[PDB]
Amino acid sequence: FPMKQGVLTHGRVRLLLSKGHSCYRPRRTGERKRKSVRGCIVDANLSVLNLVIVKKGEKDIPGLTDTTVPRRLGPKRASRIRKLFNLSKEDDVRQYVVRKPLNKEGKKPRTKAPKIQRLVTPRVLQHKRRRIALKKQRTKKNKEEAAEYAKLLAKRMKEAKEKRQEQIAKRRRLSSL
Amino acid sequence: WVCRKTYVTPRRPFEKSRLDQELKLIGEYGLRNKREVWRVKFTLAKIRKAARELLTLDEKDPRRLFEGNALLRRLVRIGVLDEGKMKLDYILGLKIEDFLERRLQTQVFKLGLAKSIHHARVLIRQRHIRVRKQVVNIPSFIVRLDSQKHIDFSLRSPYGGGRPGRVKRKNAKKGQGGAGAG
Amino acid sequence: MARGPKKHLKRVAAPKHWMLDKLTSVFAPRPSTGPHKLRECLPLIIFLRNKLKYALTGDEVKKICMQRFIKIDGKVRADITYPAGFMDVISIDKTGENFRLIYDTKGRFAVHRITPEEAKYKLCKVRKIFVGTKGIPHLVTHDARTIRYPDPLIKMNDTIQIDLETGKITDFIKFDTGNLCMVTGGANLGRIGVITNRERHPGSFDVVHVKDANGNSFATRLSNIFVIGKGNKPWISLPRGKGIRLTIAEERDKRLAAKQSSG
Amino acid sequence: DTVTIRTRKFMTNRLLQRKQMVIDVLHPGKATVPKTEIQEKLAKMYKTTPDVIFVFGFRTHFGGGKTTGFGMIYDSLDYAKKNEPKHRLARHGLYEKKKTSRKQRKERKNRMKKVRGTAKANVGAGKKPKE
RNA sequence: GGGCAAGUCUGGUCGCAGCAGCCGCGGUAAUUCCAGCUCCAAUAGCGUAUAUUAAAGUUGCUGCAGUUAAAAAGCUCGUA
RNA sequence: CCUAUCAACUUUCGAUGGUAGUCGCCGUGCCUACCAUGGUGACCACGGGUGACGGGGAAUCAGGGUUCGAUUCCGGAGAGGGAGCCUGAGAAACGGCUACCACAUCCAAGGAAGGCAGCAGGCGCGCAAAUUACCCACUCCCGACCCGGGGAGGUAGUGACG
RNA sequence: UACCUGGUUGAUCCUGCCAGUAGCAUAUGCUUGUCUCAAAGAUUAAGCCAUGCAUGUCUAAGUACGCACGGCCGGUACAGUGAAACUGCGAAUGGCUCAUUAAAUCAGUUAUGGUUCCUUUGGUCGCUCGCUCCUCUCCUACUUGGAUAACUGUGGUAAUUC
């Protein structure tokens, strides 16, 4: 039974573990599985202590500091690549991306880079000239259909509103006779 | 999904005068059992009452006319009723045996290769006839007017014209192994 | 426990005017949600493989909708069971055939080839005319096509020749007395003819006394009255079975005729 | 013998790109001459290379004499293979269906449940049980 | 055995064994048994059990009966 | 549907009305503040009895009538019984959860994992009821979706129901 | 098909039930050749359920950094394809069963002008109508921030979809 952010003191407890608490691997939306969870503090009960050397010493552990277990996935966002050099964002990624030479993946090596998201391309420039095209098109198509009715509205009135002057004059005749 | 009985049961179990009267219609028309009597007995009680209800309806009712003129036509397309009378008073006067004559069996006995009405049921049951382009195997078939104009030998009856099955061959084997000594 | 709405639909307890069979297929096409209420609606798959019968299986009709050969109301359809209501044209984009969904006086959908002149406009008797927010009048028809800026002389139950190419309404026909109205529903389904009378009641439940073309005068409510234009002025062609009214003793004289008279 | 495919209710199915008709063949005393013959016979009627003619129907009428079939002369095999029920492909076998058969696939759905990621391990989780 | 169609059969049994919804046989010259035989009945069904509908005007709305067979209160006012 | 060998019932717990607001998808004694004593019954209320799912419809009867509706449909109700939450537009989901109550499992004893009134099938009970079947093709269904999946369903089996 | 038949008794006429008499629909006795149709764990256990399985899903269009597969074609992010994975939706419905509830369900008729609704059908998307221009200095528009899955390994776990 593992340990998480706040299982407080060391005695193994059980909490109604929802999505949003650790020591838990969820299985369904709307499911809250109460499972046994070991205390965040350590008395003696553990088989494994998950520990992290945040600062090393001076005489090396071979397994941890002389050994190296690296990892390979690089930035699939644009600006992480740029900022460390104090390099700008209008002057793009400008190749520094971690393209991954992956050999015999067919019979050749690919060299695959993470296809960067949050990245404005000329396709995005095509779509930026396609998106607010439609927004500016929407302001004018709203304006077009308004003026079509306004002429249609007022020209009908000259038969309708002229009847009002026809009825005011015969109101005073109906008061007369 | 939906099924029904096509025979009928009277409320009197032993009415021996009726029980031997039902023996007549089997012997007069070639029936299987009293069920073949009770099958048309199941129908004809409904036929008279349908004739009775339309008679008691007010005239110029489409449910009297359009249903009834169908019922006039349906009884005449099969040729049981004739439409020279064609009113509900005479439909109260029809009987079982008008249908039995319009069965396939008696028309085979009337017309064709039947010597008996034992024989006439056999020629349908042993499929010697085609009433159309149709090997018809049902003796209670009750026919129409045009139906009595195409009853022939079947082409599966190898006598009177037909592809041999195994029987005229056996009757040939009565002369080619019954007389061929092997 | 009815813990949500039913996402399934079987046969025979299905609408009869779709002319489905008995339990031969144990499920219904089940039309989608859309512009019209679900009983008015007709699946494409009934019109495709059960009325025109160019297909025979369902996954073909899915791929026929992936062919996108179907334009209902002049608009591209990839729905096998599109909720298409009344006077809805169906453009079969490969055979070049337009068919507008109107009802017969027999009680069946009419496979009814209107001219492509008559396909650009359909007549929708309006559902509402409302002054929307910021002082803006509207018309919204029975197929819920929200159209801003109506006509400034229309009132309720006017028929708009709905431009099926655009929406964005074209010219109207005012709700007038004596108009041609394909009366639909009840014992008066599919009956076209002049109005000649309308009866009013405060509250609800107004009946409309309609005398059709054959002379059958009948009082049937305005819900059963869909106006299709002007009196003695149709705007599409008349459907099969004359689209007015038929008697059943005459209908046998109809049903005896073209069977074994053709080819 | 005396076959005579009677193409009743011919339908130029333009939106499925095919010739669509009812096959109605006649017989002396033995109904239903075989289907691919009827394809090859409906071939030379229409000169259409009958492995695009995907027929079905073919129930034998009582008394020999006649058989009603059905014909879909697709105007191409691409016109065939686009429309094509798989049991019409399996009507005269030139394509067939899945033969896992159906319970191992329902078993593989029990395998993706248990861990996240690596469907190969979950295919491998369904691979080891064969009982 | 009748009702209930078809054995005043043939044998045995002898108020036994059984049968018989009911009415009933069998106590020795058994048409009721038990069988044979013959016949009848329906028939790929037929028979039983139970259930219910009619028959049943024995629940009577149509359409019950209430002097003596069941059924006018001890009598009267008197409300619903 | 049955019962007067059920005649009065309903609130101390709001029973019923108002006002006021709370809350709830919202009408509402919903809810209380508060006020009123209401509200209702021999036309059988109140209460009790009914395998009372109800109805579309079903069988029979000259008619009049009489029996059925768990039962290929509709609507309702539960998935062991309650309770509480959740998700989503829609679920107190038992092919969710949480706990309880009555059951069922692994246990290495810590704990872990469970509810066929889904198809079957199994037992159980009985007089009494079939594949632990095949297919997602037909039917439809859900999807991001033609694609797929589906014991829905189809398919045969079982099957003198008839 | 609007029926009756037998039984009270010394005999008779009654009343009057008895029993025969047909429908049925399970249970069953016995028997059964074809071919078409088919009800079937409701009764009794809304009993427990073993097991088999009963809602999945990618579009030219969310994210390809599969350890994949296939290629020179690669760089700005580049892969043809693409497990997964994260993301989008169903999973509530379906089936099953009627235990339950007696104006309750349900049925017919009405109304929400009390109420909420994914989806789909249609409109709506420049703006702050300029803070009487930050929205020209608010300089992020050619676009933002960090933060996880798959990936990896360390793993612990009698056992767990841990």
Side-chain angles (χ1 to χ4, degrees):
Chain A
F1 299 103
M3 288 159 61
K4 62 164 286 297
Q5 188 184 356
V7 216
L8 301 177
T9 68
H10 60 271
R12 196 270 308 281
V13 293
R14 64 182 297 159
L15 308 174
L16 184 58
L17 296 175
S18 300
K19 297 176 177 63
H21 289 87
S22 297
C23 298
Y24 180 67
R25 187 168 294 175
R27 301 292 179 183
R28 184 177 174 84
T29 64
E31 185 186 9
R32 299 178 294 174
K33 295 301 288 181
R34 186 174 179 179
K35 292 181 181 292
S36 296
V37 286
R38 198 264 189 191
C40 187
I41 308 175
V42 177
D43 195 2
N45 199 6
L46 294 167
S47 296
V48 158
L49 274 165
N50 295 326
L51 305 167
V52 170
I53 309 172
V54 296
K55 291 181 176 67
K56 73 180 298 297
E58 62 180 1
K59 181 173 178 294
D60 289 331
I61 163 69
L64 297 168
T65 57
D66 297 328
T67 312
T68 300
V69 182
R71 88 291 184 278
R72 70 183 186 274
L73 274 79
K76 199 172 185 294
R77 63 190 63 185
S79 297
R80 180 180 290 172
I81 287 166
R82 302 172 186 174
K83 184 171 173 62
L84 185 62
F85 303 102
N86 295 114
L87 188 273
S88 64
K89 68 182 178 69
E90 300 292 327
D91 294 330
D92 297 332
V93 184
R94 189 164 287 174
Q95 174 183 354
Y96 301 108
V97 72
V98 185
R99 49 183 54 72
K100 184 61 66 178
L102 191 51
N103 50 3
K104 293 181 178 65
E105 193 179 2
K107 297 178 179 65
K108 292 176 179 291
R110 280 172 71 99
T111 304
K112 47 178 70 176
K115 192 176 182 294
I116 289 175
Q117 296 303 109
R118 284 172 285 167
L119 182 63
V120 171
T121 60
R123 174 59 58 85
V124 179
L125 291 172
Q126 186 275 131
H127 278 291
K128 187 177 73 71
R129 291 185 293 269
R130 185 82 281 289
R131 284 190 300 274
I132 69 170
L134 295 168
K135 294 181 181 180
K136 182 174 67 67
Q137 283 171 358
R138 182 66 265 166
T139 49
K140 65 185 182 183
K141 288 182 287 185
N142 288 317
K143 189 64 64 67
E144 287 167 353
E145 297 167 353
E148 296 167 353
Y149 171 66
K151 297 183 184 293
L152 181 66
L153 173 58
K155 69 184 181 183
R156 190 267 311 153
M157 290 182 179
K158 296 179 177 65
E159 297 86 4
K161 190 70 176 177
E162 194 181 4
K163 187 70 178 176
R164 184 182 70 85
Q165 287 83 15
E166 298 185 359
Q167 294 295 319
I168 293 170
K170 65 185 285 183
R171 191 268 308 276
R172 296 177 63 82
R173 292 178 179 89
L174 191 63
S175 69
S176 297
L177 280 78
Chain B
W1 293 270
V2 58
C3 291
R4 73 186 291 168
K5 292 181 180 179
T6 54
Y7 60 91
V8 73
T9 302
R11 294 183 71 187
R12 287 180 175 89
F14 288 102
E15 195 178 0
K16 190 70 176 178
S17 65
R18 181 187 66 191
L19 296 175
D20 291 331
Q21 185 177 2
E22 291 178 350
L23 185 62
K24 296 182 183 294
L25 305 177
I26 298 161
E28 287 164 352
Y29 292 94
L31 297 177
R32 174 72 178 179
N33 51 352
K34 272 80 180 179
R35 187 179 300 168
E36 298 291 329
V37 175
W38 290 344
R39 183 179 177 181
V40 190
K41 182 181 177 290
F42 178 72
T43 62
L44 191 273
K46 186 177 180 180
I47 298 168
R48 295 176 291 111
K49 291 184 182 293
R52 190 180 300 167
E53 292 295 326
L54 296 175
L55 185 62
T56 58
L57 284 177
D58 184 75
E59 293 179 353
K60 268 65 187 299
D61 188 3
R63 193 68 178 173
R64 182 178 183 173
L65 289 175
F66 175 73
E67 174 184 357
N69 298 319
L71 186 61
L72 287 170
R73 188 185 68 190
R74 286 182 177 179
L75 288 173
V76 170
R77 286 189 288 171
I78 60 178
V80 172
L81 179 63
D82 295 333
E83 61 190 2
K85 300 183 289 184
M86 204 178 182
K87 67 172 176 285
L88 300 162
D89 293 331
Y90 297 106
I91 310 169
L92 290 172
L94 271 73
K95 64 182 180 180
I96 300 294
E97 294 181 353
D98 292 328
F99 300 97
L100 299 175
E101 293 172 353
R102 290 289 184 273
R103 288 178 65 250
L104 186 60
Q105 180 179 0
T106 61
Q107 300 298 320
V108 167
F109 178 70
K110 293 173 184 67
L111 300 175
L113 60 155
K115 189 73 179 296
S116 297
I117 40 174
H118 298 95
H119 199 196
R121 195 175 183 87
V122 163
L123 300 167
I124 307 163
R125 185 71 181 175
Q126 301 183 354
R127 68 186 59 80
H128 307 107
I129 60 170
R130 282 178 189 268
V131 185
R132 270 84 174 178
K133 192 179 175 291
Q134 283 188 354
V135 168
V136 175
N137 204 0
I138 303 100
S140 298
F141 175 69
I142 297 168
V143 311
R144 291 177 186 175
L145 293 171
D146 55 353
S147 304
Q148 296 174 357
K149 302 176 181 66
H150 303 285
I151 299 170
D152 299 330
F153 280 98
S154 68
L155 296 177
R156 295 292 296 163
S157 67
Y159 73 117
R163 181 176 67 187
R166 84 293 192 293
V167 187
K168 187 180 74 178
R169 301 176 64 88
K170 175 173 70 178
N171 292 120
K173 284 188 284 183
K174 288 182 180 179
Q176 296 174 357
Chain C
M1 277 182 168
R3 293 193 301 278
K6 294 181 182 294
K7 294 181 183 291
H8 297 88
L9 183 63
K10 295 182 183 290
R11 204 171 277 181
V12 193
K16 187 67 181 294
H17 67 91
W18 292 351
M19 300 304 292
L20 289 174
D21 289 331
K22 297 183 179 67
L23 193 144
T24 61
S25 294
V26 292
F27 288 94
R30 188 187 57 78
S32 176
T33 53
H36 299 91
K37 292 189 72 173
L38 86 168
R39 191 176 180 180
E40 180 186 1
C41 303
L42 180 65
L44 176 66
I45 190 166
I46 294 173
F47 183 70
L48 179 60
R49 48 86 58 82
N50 298 319
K51 291 181 183 293
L52 294 177
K53 302 181 188 296
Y54 292 102
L56 287 177
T57 54
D59 191 75
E60 289 183 353
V61 181
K62 290 183 179 180
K63 291 177 183 290
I64 292 155
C65 286
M66 293 296 108
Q67 290 164 355
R68 291 182 181 179
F69 288 167
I70 295 96
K71 292 178 177 64
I72 302 168
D73 291 330
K75 299 175 184 179
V76 178
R77 298 291 181 265
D79 193 359
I80 63 170
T81 58
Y82 180 76
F86 184 71
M87 282 189 75
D88 294 332
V89 73
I90 298 171
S91 177
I92 305 299
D93 301 330
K94 183 70 180 296
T95 66
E97 294 295 326
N98 298 115
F99 293 101
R100 176 162 288 175
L101 295 174
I102 53 171
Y103 291 93
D104 293 327
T105 188
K106 287 182 179 289
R108 293 183 286 168
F109 284 94
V111 180
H112 182 70
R113 194 262 183 276
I114 63 172
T115 71
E117 298 293 328
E118 296 168 352
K120 296 182 184 293
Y121 66 97
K122 69 178 182 180
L123 276 83
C124 290
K125 184 180 71 63
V126 292
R127 190 177 68 191
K128 68 183 75 171
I129 292 171
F130 181 73
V131 181
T133 64
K134 307 286 102 175
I136 301 168
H138 301 286
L139 70 89
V140 183
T141 57
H142 61 86
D143 54 355
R145 295 187 176 179
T146 303
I147 300 302
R148 52 189 286 171
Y149 297 102
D151 299 332
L153 69 157
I154 59 171
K155 292 296 182 289
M156 298 299 171
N157 287 318
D158 295 333
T159 64
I160 311 292
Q161 294 180 358
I162 296 294
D163 195 2
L164 296 176
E165 299 173 354
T166 59
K168 297 297 180 181
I169 52 97
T170 56
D171 59 354
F172 71 100
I173 294 167
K174 191 76 177 178
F175 180 70
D176 299 329
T177 63
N179 285 328
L180 289 184
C181 301
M182 186 176 286
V183 183
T184 55
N188 305 114
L189 175 59
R191 304 192 181 184
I192 68 173
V194 296
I195 300 170
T196 317
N197 191 3
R198 289 192 292 269
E199 293 85 6
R200 301 295 94 195
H201 306 286
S204 298
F205 298 103
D206 296 335
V207 297
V208 172
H209 177 74
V210 173
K211 177 177 174 67
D212 62 357
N214 287 324
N216 203 167
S217 297
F218 53 90
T220 310
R221 296 174 184 173
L222 188 61
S223 65
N224 296 111
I225 309 302
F226 189 84
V227 186
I228 62 170
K230 191 59 67 184
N232 295 318
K233 178 61 177 65
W235 294 93
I236 57 172
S237 298
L238 274 72
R240 63 183 181 178
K242 296 178 183 178
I244 307 166
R245 185 68 269 167
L246 77 164
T247 63
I248 62 172
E250 186 184 2
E251 191 176 4
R252 183 172 288 165
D253 296 331
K254 296 180 182 179
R255 289 186 291 178
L256 63 87
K259 177 171 176 176
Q260 197 55 256
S261 296
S262 297
Chain D
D1 186 73
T2 68
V3 178
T4 311
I5 305 173
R6 186 167 299 280
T7 67
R8 289 185 180 178
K9 299 173 177 63
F10 186 83
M11 186 180 290
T12 303
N13 190 347
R14 301 175 184 175
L15 75 155
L16 285 79
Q17 293 78 232
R18 71 190 182 189
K19 297 178 181 292
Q20 187 177 2
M21 80 300 294
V22 181
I23 290 175
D24 294 324
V25 297
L26 297 174
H27 302 90
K30 187 180 187 297
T32 315
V33 288
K35 300 169 78 81
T36 58
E37 173 185 358
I38 296 302
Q39 295 178 359
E40 290 171 352
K41 189 164 186 284
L42 189 62
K44 65 177 179 287
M45 291 176 180
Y46 284 83
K47 299 176 178 65
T48 52
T49 67
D51 284 330
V52 300
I53 303 175
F54 278 74
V55 299
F56 58 93
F58 287 86
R59 75 284 308 151
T60 89
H61 286 87
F62 62 97
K66 187 174 172 62
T67 288
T68 295
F70 190 81
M72 291 183 183
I73 304 170
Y74 295 100
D75 300 331
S76 176
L77 190 61
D78 295 332
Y79 293 160
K81 293 287 181 181
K82 184 170 69 175
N83 300 317
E84 279 175 353
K86 295 178 183 178
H87 68 276
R88 185 178 300 164
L89 292 166
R91 190 56 58 98
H92 52 96
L94 59 95
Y95 178 71
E96 293 178 354
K97 68 178 183 181
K98 291 179 262 72
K99 295 182 187 295
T100 57
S101 178
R102 185 187 167 92
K103 268 75 68 181
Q104 287 71 240
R105 301 195 301 272
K106 290 170 183 181
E107 183 181 0
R108 292 299 185 278
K109 298 191 286 184
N110 303 318
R111 303 299 176 188
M112 291 290 290
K113 298 178 175 67
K114 301 189 285 186
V115 301
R116 177 177 288 174
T118 320
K120 296 176 93 291
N122 294 319
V123 169
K127 183 68 174 65
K128 183 175 174 65
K130 296 179 177 66
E131 294 177 353

